[PDB]
C-alpha cells in the first residue's frame, strides 16, 4: 500500500549513492556498506538455539515475511525448521550489535513453503512465506517493499537492467560484514544463464550478475539467501522485490551467475496463502 517508499529517502525526497546506477540502466561479495534505512524492508532469519544467522528475508507487510524455501526446508541436510526454532530480526543494520530502539524481534505464527518447491533437483519455486505472531510497527527503519505485478514485471525485468541485492552474508567463498551490504547487479539474458551452468533452469528463476568482460564484479553469497533483489520503478519511485536470493555455484566465479526466485512468476501463490488467512 504505502509499500516501496523508504522513510529516510523517498519520503524525504533523497537518493542513496547507488540509486541512479539502477535508473541509468533501464535502457555479498564486492558490495558496499548499505546506508542507514536504505533497505528498510531487509530482514534477518535468526536461529534461536544455537543463536545464529541463517538467512535473509523481506518484510512485505506488517504481518508477512518473504524468503527462500531452501532457507527453511532442505531434506538433504535434515533441515526442517519450525515456527519456534526461529526468529526474525527487522530494522537491523549491524550484523552483530543489538540495535535496541531500532530493530524489532518478531516471532513466527506459521511457516508456508511453496507446495511445488523442488529441492531434489534445482530449487524450482524456491519461495516461502512467514506469518508473524505479532504485527510489526513501521519506523524509519522498518518498512515494506512492494510485490511486482504484470506491468512492473514487464518494464523492469529485462537483461541489462540492474537490480539491487543486500545482505549480511559472506564477503567471499568459504568473513561476515559488520553492517548490511549492498551491491547492484544486472539481469542476465536467460540463454546465457542457461548455458552458464549444467543445472536445469526454469522460468521460475532468473539470473543477475556481470559478465567476464564487463570489468565490474559482485554477487550474493552464504547468508544472503532468502534476501531480496529489488528494482526502483522509474515511474512511481517505488521499490519492488523482483527476486529472492536462491542459489548459485560458488560466489562471484567468472562466467558464473547468481540465481534468484522469480517472484512475479509465483505471485499467484503468495496472494493465495495471504488471502486464505
Q: Is 70 a catalytic residue?
A: yes
User: Does the annotation mark 225 as catalytic?
Assistant: yes
Catalytic residue, chosen from 39, 58, 61, 70, is 70
Sort 12 into a burial class: Cβ within 10 Å, 0-12 / 13-18 / 19+: exposed
Cell of 71: 532457507
162-167 and 181-186 as β-strands: parallel, antiparallel, unpaired?
Answer: antiparallel
Q: How far apart are CA 247 and CA 204, in angstroms?
A: 13
Q: List beta partners, residue 67.
A: 128
Q: Which of 39, 106, 114, 126 is catalytic?
A: 126
CB 154 within 8 A of CB 148: no
Q: Cα–Cα distance between 55 and 85 in angstroms, integer?
A: 13
**Residue 75 backbone class (left: φ over 0; alpha: ψ -120 to 50; beta: rest):** alpha
Nearest to 34 by CA among 237, 233, 230, 242: 230
Q: And the C-alpha cell for 121?
A: 533437483
Domain extents in the chain: 28-39+145-264, 40-144+265-275
Q: Say which residue the cell 543494520 belongs to.
A: 93
Compute the C-alpha angle 70/225/30, nearest 5°: 155
- Alpha carbon distances (Å) from 91 to 74, 164, 223, 266: 27, 18, 17, 26
Q: How many residues comprise the chain?
A: 277
Q: Across the strands, what pairs with 205?
A: 261
Side-chain-side CA neighbours of residue 142 (13 Å): 25
DSSP for the chain?
--TT--TTTGGGT---TTHHHHHTT---BT-EE--TTSSTTEEEEEETTTTEEEEEEEEEETTEEEE-STTTEEGGGTEE--TTTEEEEES--BSSS--TTT-EEE-EEEEEE-TT-BTTTT-BT--EEEEESSPPPP-SS--PPBPP-HHHHHHH--TT-EEEEEES--SS-----SB-EEEEEEBPPHHHHHTTSSS---TTEEEE---TTSS---B--TT-TT-EEEEEETTTTEEEEEEEEEEESSSS-TT--EEEE-GGGGHHHHHHHHHT-
**Can you tell me the distance from the alpha carbon of 231 to that of 57, in angstroms, rounded to the nearest whole number?**
16
Set 39, 58, 225, 246: catalytic member? 225
User: How far apart, in whole angstroms, are the C-alpha atoms of residue 262 and residue 223?
Assistant: 19
Query: Pairing mode, if any, of strands 104-106 and 258-261?
Result: unpaired
Measured CA to CA, the distance from residue 119 to residue 71 in angstroms comes to 11
Residues 6+ apart with CB under 8 A from 53: 44, 45, 46, 47, 95, 168, 223
Nearby residues of 93 by Cβ (< 8 Å), 6 or more positions away: 34, 36, 99, 102, 103, 141, 179, 180
* Measured distance CA(188)–CA(162) in Å, rounded: 9
> Resolution reached, in Å?
2.8
Taking the CA of residue 134 as centre, how many other CA atoms within 13 Å lie in the half-sphere pointing to its CB?
A: 11
61 is catalytic: no
Beta carbons within 8 Å of 212's beta carbon, 6+ residues apart: 254, 255
Query: Which residue, among 57, 43, 164, 115, has the nearest Cα to 270 in the 3D structure?
Result: 115
Non-local (6+) Cβ contacts of 137 within 8 A are 62, 104
With CA atoms as reference, report the closest residue to 96 among 175, 178, 169, 31: 178
CA atoms of 162 and 157, how far apart (whole Å): 9
* 40-144+265-275 shares the fold of 28-39+145-264: yes
Nearest to 259 by CA among 199, 170, 217, 211: 199
Fold of 28-39+145-264: Thrombin, subunit H (2.40.10)
Cell numbers 527476486 correspond to 243
Distance CA 18, CA 80 (A): 37
What CA–CA distance (Å, rounded) separates 123 from 118? 5
- CA-CA distances (angstroms) from residue 93 to 47, 179, 237, 256? 18, 5, 23, 29
Q: How was this structure determined?
A: X-ray
- CA distances to 159, 226, 264 from 34, rounded to whole Å, are 24, 18, 26
Q: Which CATH architecture has domain 40-144+265-275?
A: Beta Barrel (2.40)
Residue 259 · residue 68 · CB < 8 Å? no
- With contact defined as beta carbons under 8 Å apart, do 267 and 242 qualify? no
Amino acid at each position: 500500500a504505502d509499500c516501496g517508499l523508504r522513510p529516510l529517502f523517498e519520503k524525504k525526497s533523497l537518493e542513496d549513492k547507488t540509486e541512479r546506477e539502477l535508473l541509468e540502466s533501464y535502457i555479498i561479495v564486492e558490495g558496499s556498506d548499505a546506508e542507514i534505512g536504505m533497505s528498510p524492508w531487509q530482514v534477518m532469519l535468526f536461529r534461536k538455539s544455537p543463536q545464529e544467522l541463517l538467512c535473509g528475508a523481506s518484510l512485505i507487510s506488517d504481518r508477512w515475511v518473504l524468503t527462500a524455501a531452501h532457507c527453511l526446508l532442505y531434506p538433504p541436510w535434515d533441515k526442517n525448521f519450525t515456527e519456534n526454532d526461529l526468529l526474525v530480526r527487522i530494522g537491523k543494520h549491524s550484523r552483530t550489535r543489538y540495535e535496541a530502539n531500532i530493530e524489532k524481534i518478531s516471532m513466527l505464527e506459521k511457516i508456508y513453503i511453496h507446495p511445488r518447491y523442488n529441492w531434489r533437483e534445482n530449487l524450482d519455486r524456491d519461495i516461502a512465506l512467514m506469518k508473524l505472531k505479532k504485527p510489526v510497527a513501521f519506523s524509519d527503519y522498518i518498512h515494506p517493499v512492494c510485490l511486482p505485478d504484470r506491468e512492473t514485471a514487464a518494464s523492469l525485468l529485462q537483461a541489462g537492467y540492474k537490480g539491487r541485492v543486500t545482505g549480511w552474508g559472506n564477503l567471499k567463498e568459504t568473513g561476515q560484514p559488520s553492517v548490511l551490504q549492498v551491491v547492484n547487479l544486472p539481469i542476465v539474458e536467460r540463454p546465457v544463464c542457461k548455458d552458464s551452468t549444467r543445472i536445469r533452469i526454469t522460468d521460475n528463476m532468473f539470473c543477475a550478475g556481470y559478465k567476464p568482460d564487463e570489468g565490474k564484479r559482485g554477487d550474493a553469497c552464504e547468508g544472503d539467501s532468502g534476501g531480496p533483489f529489488v528494482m526502483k520503478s522509474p515511474f512511481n519511485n517505488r521499490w519492488y522485490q523482483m527476486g529472492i536470493v536462491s542459489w548459485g555455484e560458488g560466489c562471484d566465479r567468472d562466467g558464473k551467475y547468481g540465481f534468484y526466485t522469480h517472484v512475479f512468476r509465483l505471485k499467484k501463490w503468495i496472494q493465495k496463502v495471504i488471502d486464505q488467512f
